[PDB]
């Protein structure tokens, strides 16, 4: 399990009954949107799985397929998202970010840099089973240059696992290499960075990055913005953020999605769904710490409707 996320497993749970009340809410005219939301966002994900089981074995029509028709707009996006299992959701968002070589580079980057070894493996599996083709191929297909190399590497999900002894020598050797390969040099040995940052264990890389500051006048992030540019730079930046502080990373991503004119709902929804039973609690705390007001608050301000309520239940608290 994971004790660090909002939207905990609903106690008292009755799958059979819930599926009834959802039908009811659908069967109603205008849809009791309100109920559907009030239910599905206060149930854990597996709980939703046996509700879709129960709703199919009680009507002979698949719940997701039913709600697609029952709903519209960003609310649909949300709920439809929640019904998928974690791996399926990730897989689907991934595929949809590549639908054409007019790819949505940003969304790809996010899911890849943030997702862990286990998560990644399960995704690769589900992706192949879902779309009859390898995720690695689809990545290669829609990316180019160094960027491709990076994303592939990352998506293999073969990060060295958390070695339980601390390699103080290596940490130094790596930091050095990153410096030598980047800032110290004219131009940049990109494949080194890709190598070190993809392969090493995360708690190793955290320490590498803090050591790096002993050789370089700019921290790892600043070094990235200087030494490289483009979609590669964007990736590196995201990656580093995920290693140093992932809750914070997601917090910032959430902020950017609302701060300005209108809203980047595609991102906001994805994050709220995906991280609801993972690190949402840590995210909210980091967010509040940095931005002064709650996440709840920005979400409240930037979105409205039944939809807004869904998002709040997913945030799951006021802070
Ligand atoms: Ca209505
Ligand atoms: Ca629809
Ligand atoms: Ca594009
Ligand atoms: Ca340089
Ligand atoms: Ca806004």
Curated annotation (Swiss-Prot):
The keyword Ubl conjugation applies. Phosphorylation of Tyr-4 enhances heat stress-induced translocation to the cell surface. ISGylated. The modification Phosphotyrosine is found at residues 4, 179. InterPro entries: Annexin (IPR001464), Annexin_repeat (IPR018502), Annexin_repeat_CS (IPR018252), Annexin_sf (IPR037104), ANX2 (IPR002389). GO terms for molecular function: cadherin binding involved in cell-cell adhesion; calcium ion binding; calcium-dependent phospholipid binding; calcium-dependent protein binding; cytoskeletal protein binding; identical protein binding; phosphatidylinositol-4,5-bisphosphate binding; phosphatidylserine binding. There is a cross-link at residue 29 (Glycyl lysine isopeptide (Lys-Gly) (interchain with G-Cter in SUMO1)). Keywords: Acetylation, Annexin, Basement membrane, Calcium, Calcium/phospholipid-binding, Extracellular matrix, Host-virus interaction, Isopeptide bond, Phosphoprotein, Repeat, RNA-binding, Secreted, Ubl conjugation. The modification Phosphoserine is found at residues 6, 164. One of its GO terms (cellular component) is cytosol. It comes from the Eukaryota. Belongs to the annexin family. Heterotetramer containing 2 light chains of S100A10/p11 and 2 heavy chains of ANXA2/p36. Interacts with ATP1B1. Interacts with DYSF. Interacts with COCH. Interacts (via repeat Annexin 1) with PCSK9 (via the C-terminal domain); the interaction inhibits the degradation of LDLR. Interacts with CEACAM1 (via the cytoplasmic domain); this interaction is regulated by phosphorylation of CEACAM1. Interacts with APPL2 and APPL1; targets APPL2 to endosomes and acting in parallel to RAB5A. Interacts with S100A4. May interact with UBAP2. A pair of annexin repeats may form one binding site for calcium and phospholipid. This is Annexin A2. The lineage of its organism: Eukaryota, Metazoa, Chordata, Craniata, Vertebrata. The gene is ANXA2.
């Amino acid at each position: 399990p994971s004790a660090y996320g909002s939207v905990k497993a609903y106690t008292n749970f009755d799958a059979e009954r819930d599926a009834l009340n959802i039908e009811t809410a659908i069967k109603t005219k205008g849809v009791d949107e309100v109920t559907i939301v009030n239910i599905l966002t206060n149930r854990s994900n597996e709980q939703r799985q046996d509700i879709a089981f129960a709703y199919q074995r009680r009507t002979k029509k698949e719940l997701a397929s039913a709600l697609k028709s029952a709903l519209s707009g960003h609310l649909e996006t949300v709920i439809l998202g929640l019904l998928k299992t974690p791996a399926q959701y990730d897989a689907s968002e991934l595929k949809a970010s590549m639908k054409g070589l007019g790819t949505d580079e940003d969304s790809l980057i996010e899911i890849i840099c943030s997702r862990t070894n286990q998560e990644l493996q399960e995704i690769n599996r589900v992706y192949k089973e879902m779309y009859k083709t390898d995720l690695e191929k689809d990545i290669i297909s829609d990316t180019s240059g160094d960027f491709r190399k990076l994303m592939v590497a990352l998506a293999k999900g073969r990060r060295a696992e958390d070695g339980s002894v601390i390699d103080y020598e290596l940490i130094d050797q790596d930091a050095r290499d990153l410096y030598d390969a980047g800032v110290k040099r004219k131009g940049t040995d990109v494949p080194k960075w890709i190598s070190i940052m993809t392969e090493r264990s995360v708690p190793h890389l955290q320490k590498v990055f803090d050591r790096y500051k002993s050789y370089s006048p700019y921290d790892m992030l600043e070094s990235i913005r200087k030494e490289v540019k483009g979609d590669l730079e964007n990736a590196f930046l995201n990656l580093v953020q995920c290693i140093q502080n992932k809750p914070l990373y997601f917090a910032d991503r959430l902020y950017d999605s609302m701060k300005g004119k209108g809203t980047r709902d595609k991102v906001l929804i994805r994050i709220m769904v995906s991280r609801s039973e993972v690190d949402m609690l840590k995210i909210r705390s980091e967010f509040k710490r940095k931005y002064g007001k709650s996440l709840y608050y920005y979400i409240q301000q930037d979105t409205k409707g039944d939809y807004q309520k869904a998002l709040l239940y997913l945030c799951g608290g006021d802070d």
